[PDB]
């Protein structure tokens, strides 16, 4: 007797805790990269594995170690709760995406590699080379009590 349930976790403004607002423009911090949305083999049914907060390389391929780290995926099309894209893309279809690179404050608890592993020291210093304040001074990491 299923009781259908839907859920979400996190926002856009919890992976990016703050910006540096370049007066001269608004696109200073970001870079636009092109990636494959739906898996290369899965049918046109699978919600892709691009949860916001994954680390991607310079050419858009998802990161796997500290070596291939360039930016943090923050595109609106993969934010939690944004799930009306299921059949809109064919397998292997390749779409632009947005990465945040420069002058940003980053939550250390959200950053992950493509597999799911949490970011490590090597990845932290790699990102922090771009001028990103990777910080772990977050309040809210324990829910309700239990």
């Amino acid at each position: 007797a299923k009781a259908h349930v839907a859920t979400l976790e996190g926002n856009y403004s919890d992976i990016v805790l703050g910006r540096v607002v370049a007066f001269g423009d608004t696109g200073w911090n970001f870079k636009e990269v092109d990636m494959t949305f739906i898996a290369d083999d899965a049918d046109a049914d699978s919600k892709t594995t691009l949860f916001a907060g994954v680390l991607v390389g310079e050419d858009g391929t998802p990161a796997t170690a500290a070596a291939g780290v360039f930016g943090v995926l923050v595109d609106r099309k993969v934010l939690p709760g944004v799930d009306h894209y299921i059949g809109v893309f064919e397998p292997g279809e390749k779409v632009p995406m947005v990465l945040a690179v420069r002058g940003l404050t980053l939550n250390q608890l959200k950053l992950k590699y493509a597999d799911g592993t949490a970011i490590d020291a090597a990845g932290i210093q790699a990102l922090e080379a771009q001028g990103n304040q990777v910080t772990d001074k977050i309040v809210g990491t324990q829910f309700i009590g239990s």
């Binding site: 009781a3 349930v5 839907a6 976790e9 304040q133 910080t135 977050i138 309040v139 239990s146």
Partner: protein, 272 residues
């Protein structure tokens, strides 16, 4: 330190769920043969009238509906909805909300161990830790079956405590009218179920208060004029045939009782 990096607040969670609603009809009809040539029962020679019978049947219908509502209210505490003979709305709230029953088994045969200290350690601690903030004046209440209560009171470790409790007339002031017994000790209220809705040898604990922990949802009746208009507590329709030979009475009500926080209810059982 003054000048260094600051802190942030970056947590949240949400859920959403949908449920159905059951349906409960009830109807009666009255013929000519029921009223004509008869007296009214408590008036000797006065002739029978249709209005008296109609009013009596309306009273019976309302009483039955009230009994049904009272029965359905208890099912919420157990953690399941009330809808007999229709496996389409029988929902188990614990799995629906992804929670599990915390079980506090009490052994009444262990004379050397205080029963109401096992509850204090297991159930009341957890119900308060998981209670959550913003809850004002929530009093822990224990509802138990008659056998469980009788076993508890007779336990030697609690005979001394009970013998000194008044247990005379307070039931009329701590509550308003039920005749079931009351026992209050160690900041816990114990009550005996009198309607038999609690299985023998079982007891349940809930915190009371906590606004919006239990709710009742209502849906319209199966009638063309209000198929999507609004809901009401209880519909009553009275129709008298256009040919002056029969009359009909119908009642309608559909509702579902919801337990929003199954995590906060503790189920207890014991030996005897």
């Amino acid at each position: 330190q003054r000048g260094g990096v600051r802190q942030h607040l970056a947590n949240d969670r949400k859920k959403i769920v949908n449920l159905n609603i059951p349906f409960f009809p009830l109807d009666r009809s009255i013929d000519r043969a029921d009223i004509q040539n008869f007296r009214e029962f408590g008036t000797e020679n006065a002739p029978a009238t249709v209005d008296a019978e109609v009013q009596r049947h309306m009273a019976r219908i309302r009483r039955s509906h009230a009994i049904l509502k009272s029965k359905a209210m208890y099912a919420a505490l157990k953690g399941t909805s009330w809808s007999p003979d229709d496996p389409v709305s029988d929902y188990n709230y614990y799995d629906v909300w992804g929670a599990t029953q915390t079980t506090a088994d009490v052994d009444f045969t262990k004379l050397g161990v205080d029963p109401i200290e096992v509850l204090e350690a297991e159930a009341r601690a957890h119900i308060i830790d998981w209670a959550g903030d913003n809850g004002d004046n929530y009093e822990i209440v224990v509802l138990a079956s008659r056998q469980w209560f009788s076993a508890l009171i007779a336990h030697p470790q609690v005979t001394g405590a009970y013998s000194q409790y008044p247990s005379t007339q307070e039931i009329l002031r701590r509550r308003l009218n039920a005749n079931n017994r009351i026992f209050e000790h160690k900041n816990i209220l114990f009550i005996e179920d009198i309607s038999g809705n609690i299985p023998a040898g079982e007891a349940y604990i809930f915190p009371r208060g906590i606004s919006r922990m239990f709710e009742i949802y209502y849906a319209p009746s199966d009638t063309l004029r209000d198929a999507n208009q609004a809901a009401q507590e209880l519909y009553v329709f009275f129709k008298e045939s256009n040919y002056l030979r029969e009359a009909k009475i119908e009642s309608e009500t559909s509702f579902l009782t919801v337990n929003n926080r199954p995590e906060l209810v503790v189920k207890s059982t014991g030996k005897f």
